[PDB]
C-alpha cells in the first residue's frame, strides 16, 4: 500500500531525516494559519494524492501570501486531481501540505526497491534529480549507482559513503548523505516497505541535504505486523470496488471493456482475459474468485463486475475448486435472478459435474450460455457482445 507525502515526511522525522517544516491541512482556515507557524514565506502548497505528476497538473505551487494559500486550499479541497498517473477521475484531494519553500542548489535522486533479479533490497542514487528515474535508466543508465543491502549484515556506512562519492559529494555532505542512507535502509527494513523514492533529495543553497519529496510504498503482506502503518491507509485514494471485493475474498481490478470475466485463479483470470482479447473481445476487468464459488460469493462478484455500466456480457470461467460444478451452476443461476443480470453470461465449467452443471444452466431458461470448452466460451461472449 501507498503512503501520502505528508505521511512519509512524518516518518522521516521520526527517524531524524531532514524534510522541510510543513503542516498537513484539511480546511483552508488551517492552510492559511500554517503560513505564520512556518514563517516568512514564500511557501509551497501541495495537493496530497497518492499519484505522481501533481506538479504538472497544477497540484503544487509556490505562493506569496496567506491569501494565495486560502485560495489554493479552496480550489482543491474536495476536488479530484487528475495526474498522468491517475485515471480519468484522478484522486480526491482531502488534504493540502503547506511547507517552507526551499533554497535549491542541486537536485539528486535517492531510491530503494526489492530487486527480484538479485533478491536484494537495492538503493539507487543519481545526479539527475527532478526526473522520472525510468527515463534516466533507459536514457543514461550510467548516471545511476546502486548498492544492495546484505541480509546477514544490514546496511553499512561504506555503502553510504560509496554512493556519496559516486555522486561527487564531498565533506560534511558525504557524511550527511551517509546518515540519510543509513536511516532509510533502517526504515525500509523495520517497516517492511517495498519502495522508497526521495526525488528530489536536494543540496540547499546553504549546503545541507534535505528530502524535498517522499514517496513510500509499504508491503501489504506485512501489515499484520505494522499496526501504525495499518492505520495510515487512505482508502479514498483506491477504487472502492477493490476494497469491496477484498472483503469477500475476491481480487478485482477494473478496466475499459464491454466483457466481464469472473475466474478462479489470478493466472487463469489473466489467461482468460487474454483469450477473450485474442478473439476480438475487450475485457472490462480482472476478477479472481478467492474463496470457493459459493452462491453468496458468486453473487457479490456479479455486483462488483456489473457496477461498471459499459459491461455487455459476462464470461464466467471456472476450472476446479472446492465446490462441485453443479453447485456453482446453481449459484450462478441464482445470482442472475436475484442480482438481476440483464446481460448474457457465457459459462465454462470444468471439473466435477461439469457436464451435469452445464445442463442445469442450459435448462434454466435464463440467458446463460454453457460453452463447450474455453475457446468456444471465448468466441461466444465476443459474439454475444
Amino acid at each position: 500500500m501507498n503512503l501520502h507525502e505528508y505521511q512519509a515526511k512524518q516518518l522521516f522525522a521520526r527517524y531524524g531525516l531532514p524534510a522541510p517544516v510543513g503542516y498537513a491541512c484539511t480546511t483552508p482556515r488551517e492552510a492559511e494559519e500554517a503560513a505564520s507557524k512556518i514563517g516568512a514565506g514564500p511557501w509551497v502548497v501541495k495537493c496530497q494524492v497518492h499519484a505522481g505528476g501533481r506538479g504538472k497538473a497544477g497540484g503544487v505551487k509556490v505562493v506569496n501570501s496567506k491569501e494565495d494559500i486560502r485560495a489554493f486550499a479552496e480550489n482543491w479541497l474536495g476536488k479530484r486531481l487528475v495526474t498522468y498517473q491517475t485515471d480519468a477521475n484522478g484522486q480526491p484531494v482531502n488534504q493540502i501540505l503547506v511547507e517552507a519553500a526551499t533554497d535549491i542548489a542541486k537536485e539528486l535522486y535517492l531510491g530503494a526497491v526489492v530487486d527480484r533479479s538479485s533478491r536484494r533490497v537495492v538503493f539507487m542514487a543519481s545526479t539527475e534529480g527532478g526526473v522520472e528515474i525510468e527515463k534516466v535508466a533507459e536514457e543514461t543508465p550510467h548516471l545511476i549507482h546502486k548498492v544492495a543491502l546484505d541480509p546477514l549484515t544490514g546496511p553499512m556506512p561504506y555503502q553510504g559513503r560509496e554512493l556519496a562519492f559516486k555522486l561527487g559529494l564531498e565533506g560534511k555532505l558525504v557524511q550527511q548523505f551517509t546518515k540519510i542512507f543509513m536511516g532509510l535502509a533502517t526504515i525500509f527494513l523495520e517497516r517492511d516497505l517495498a519502495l522508497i523514492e526521495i526525488n528530489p533529495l536536494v543540496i540547499t543553497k546553504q549546503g545541507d541535504l534535505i528530502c524535498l519529496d517522499g514517496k513510500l510504498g509499504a508491503d501489504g503482506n506485512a501489515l499484520f505486523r505494522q499496526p501504525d502503518l495499518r492505520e495510515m491507509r487512505d482508502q479514498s485514494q483506491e477504487d472502492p470496488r477493490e476494497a469491496q471485493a477484498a472483503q469477500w475474498e475476491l481480487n478485482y481490478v477494473a478496466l475499459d471493456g464491454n466483457i466481464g470475466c469472473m475466474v478462479n485463479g489470478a493466472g487463469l483470470a489473466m489467461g482468460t482475459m487474454d483469450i477473450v482479447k485474442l478473439h476480438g473481445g475487450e475485457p472490462a476487468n480482472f476478477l479472481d474468485v478467492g474463496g470457493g464459488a459459493t452462491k453468496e460469493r458468486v453473487t457479490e462478484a456479479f455486483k462488483i463486475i456489473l457496477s461498471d455500466d459499459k459491461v455487455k456480457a459476462v464470461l464466467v470461467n471456472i476450472f476446479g475448486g472446492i465446490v462441485r460444478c453443479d453447485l456453482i451452476a446453481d449459484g450462478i443461476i441464482g445470482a442472475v435472478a436475484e442480482v438481476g443480470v440483464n446481460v448474457p453470461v457465457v459459462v465454462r465449467l470444468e471439473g466435477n459435474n461439469a457436464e451435469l452443471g452445464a445442463k442445469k444452466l442450459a435448462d434454466s431458461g435464463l440467458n446463460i450460455i454453457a460453452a463447450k470448452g474455453l475457446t468456444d466460451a471465448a468466441q461466444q461472449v465476443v459474439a454475444a457482445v
Binding site: 533479479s117 508491503d219 506485512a222 489467461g271 480482472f286 479472481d288 476450472f319
Partner: protein, 286 residues
C-alpha cells in the same frame, strides 16, 4: 520425474489445521507416503492415523522424512521454514500465501547456503502423476507421461495438465513455483532438472507478468536445454502498475510485460503459444 516419487516420505507442518487436514487426507488417498506431521503443542497425538510431533526434529528422527509440506499462516511461516531446514529436511513445499517479501528474502539466502530446496511459497505444490502428490491440485486430471510443467500459477497449470492428458501425453512431474516475488526456486532451477530427466521429453513453461525470470530462463534454455519447450505467458492485457491477484504479478517500472517475455522466449527458440488453449496442439507438433 523430478523432485518427488513413490518413495519420498513426507511430513506436514500445520497438520492439524484446516488446510493441513484437508489436503493431507487427499495425499494419503493418492498414495502419497505421508509418514506424520507437526503442530507445536499437539505432539503425542495422532491425526489421520499418522503420529503428530512437537518439533520438526522430533518428527524427522522418528520417521526418516526428507520432505515437508507447510500449511502454517503467513505470520509464522519464516519460523517454520527455518525450523524445517534446521532439522534436516531437504525438500520444503510451502503452500502459504501472504508471506512478507522481506521474510522470503532472508529465508532464500538461508535455503541456498544450506542446500535445501523450497518449492513456493504461494504455490499449488508438486505432483509426480502416478507416485506422489503434495499440494492442492486435483489429481484426477493427471496421467503418468512425458511432459514436465513448471508454472508461476496454480489453476493455469490445470489447463495444461488437462490438455497434455487429453492429447495422450500425460506428465512426468508438474511443478508450481508460486506467484510471489521471491520464490525459493525459479524456472532455471527447475528446467535444469527436467533437462536431466529421462522421463521428460518436452517441457511446458507457463509464466505471467512481472519480474524477469522468464527472460532469465529464455537465456538459459538457449544455452542449456535440449528438449523442446512450449511456453505460454498470462498477462498481455494487464494494466501497468497493478498487482494482478498474485503478489508478484505487477509490471513494475514499465518492465516485465507479457509481450517482452514471449519475445524473449521466441529467440531462445521456444514454441510460444499465444492462446492457452493450444498447449496441447503445439506439443503435438513437437
Amino acid at each position: 520425474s523430478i523432485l518427488i516419487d513413490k518413495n519420498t516420505k513426507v511430513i506436514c507442518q500445520g497438520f492439524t489445521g484446516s488446510q493441513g487436514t484437508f489436503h493431507s487426507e487427499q495425499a494419503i488417498a493418492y498414495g502419497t507416503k505421508m509418514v506424520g506431521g507437526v503442530t507445536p503443542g499437539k505432539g503425542g497425538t495422532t491425526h489421520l492415523g499418522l503420529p503428530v510431533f512437537n518439533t520438526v526434529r522430533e518428527a524427522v528422527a522418528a520417521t526418516g522424512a526428507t520432505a515437508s509440506v507447510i500449511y502454517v499462516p503467513a505470520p509464522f511461516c519464516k519460523d517454520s521454514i527455518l525450523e524445517a531446514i534446521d532439522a534436516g529436511i531437504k525438500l520444503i513445499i510451502t503452500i502459504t500465501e501472504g508471506i512478507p517479501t522481506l521474510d522470503m528474502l532472508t529465508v532464500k539466502v538461508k535455503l541456498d547456503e544450506a542446500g535445501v530446496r523450497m518449492i513456493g511459497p504461494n504455490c499449488p505444490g508438486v505432483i509426480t502423476p502416478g507416485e506422489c502428490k503434495i499440494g492442492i491440485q486435483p489429481g484426477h486430471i493427471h496421467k503418468p507421461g512425458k511432459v514436465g510443467i513448471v508454472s508461476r500459477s496454480g489453476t493455469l497449470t490445470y489447463e495444461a495438465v488437462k490438455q497434455t492428458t487429453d492429447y495422450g501425453f500425460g506428465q512426468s512431474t508438474c511443478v508450481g513455483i508460486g506467484g510471489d516475488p521471491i520464490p525459493g526456486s525459479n524456472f532455471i532451477d527447475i528446467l535444469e532438472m527436467f533437462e536431466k530427466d529421462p522421463q521428460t521429453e518436452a517441457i511446458v513453461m507457463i509464466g505471467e507478468i512481472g519480474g524477469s525470470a522468464e527472460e532469465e530462463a529464455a537465456a538459459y534454455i538457449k544455452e542449456h536445454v535440449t528438449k523442446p519447450v512450449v511456453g505460454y505467458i498470462a498477462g498481455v492485457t494487464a494494466p501497468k502498475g497493478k498487482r494482478m491477484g498474485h503478489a508478484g504479478a505487477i509490471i513494475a517500472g514499465g518492465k516485465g510485460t507479457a509481450d517482452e517475455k514471449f519475445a524473449a522466449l521466441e529467440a531462445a527458440g521456444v514454441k510460444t503459444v499465444r492462446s492457452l488453449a493450444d498447449i496441447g496442439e503445439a506439443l503435438k507438433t513437437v
